């Protein structure tokens, strides 16, 4: 588990978050 | 019914998918000029809270637009699109691993130069630390990060040595827009 794919773990989380909002629930 | 035919096709979304999603569009949509604004999508209140909404926003407009059209709106969601056994099985859709890398990869790279420098990585850090760290451990940490995914030694990540600090990475997925679905 390195640091790279902590930081782009959360990374991508908080983008599929985000364009999951844009699209509403 | 919108011209949801050619967008159909650039962007491989189910008919009621694009219906949901102009639908929902067309709620975002206010003054209703067929078109949204960082205004309009800004509205979106969990996305302002979210570290990256700013970036994620920005990322509908091209260059330097300031309005997206709904075949812009859905061009971006189509990275999201959940992958198909027909998909893979002809053009390469928006998508595609290499595609869902390009845009978190953009994301990270705000001067679109290529390469993620220490301070892009560092922004993108100070952005996701929940406990109080210290200016200091983040340089520390984006040093380290680009330091262990930088392979060329050239201090920064292009977006091969990106796309490699990910090969065990479940991207496909952790980029899929599940409700869709
Ligand atoms: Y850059
Ligand atoms: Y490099």
């Known amino acids: 588990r390195s640091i790279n794919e902590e930081i782009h773990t959360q990374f991508l989380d908080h983008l599929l978050t985000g364009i999951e909002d844009i699209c509403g629930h | ?181």
């Open chain 2, 1 to 181: 019914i919108p011209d949801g035919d050619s967008i159909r096709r650039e962007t491989g979304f189910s008919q009621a998918s694009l219906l949901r999603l102009h639908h929902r569009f067309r709620a975002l949509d206010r003054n209703k000029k067929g078109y949204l604004s960082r205004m309009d999508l800004q509205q979106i209140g969990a996305l302002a809270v979210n570290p990256l909404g700013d970036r994620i926003i920005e990322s509908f407009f091209p260059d330097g637009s300031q309005r997206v059209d709904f075949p812009g709106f859905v061009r971006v969601l189509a990275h999201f699109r959940p992958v198909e056994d027909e998909d893979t099985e002809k053009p390469e859709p928006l998508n595609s691993r290499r595609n869902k890398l390009h845009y978190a990869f953009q994301l990270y790279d705000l001067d679109r130069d290529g390469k993620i420098s220490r301070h892009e990585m560092l922004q993108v850090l100070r952005l996701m630390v929940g406990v109080q760290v210290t200016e200091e451990q983040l340089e520390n940490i984006a040093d380290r990060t680009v330091q262990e995914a930088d392979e060329d030694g050239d201090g920064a990540v292009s977006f091969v040595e990106f796309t490699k600090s990910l090969e065990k990475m479940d991207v496909e997925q952790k980029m899929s827009i599940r409700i869709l679905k």
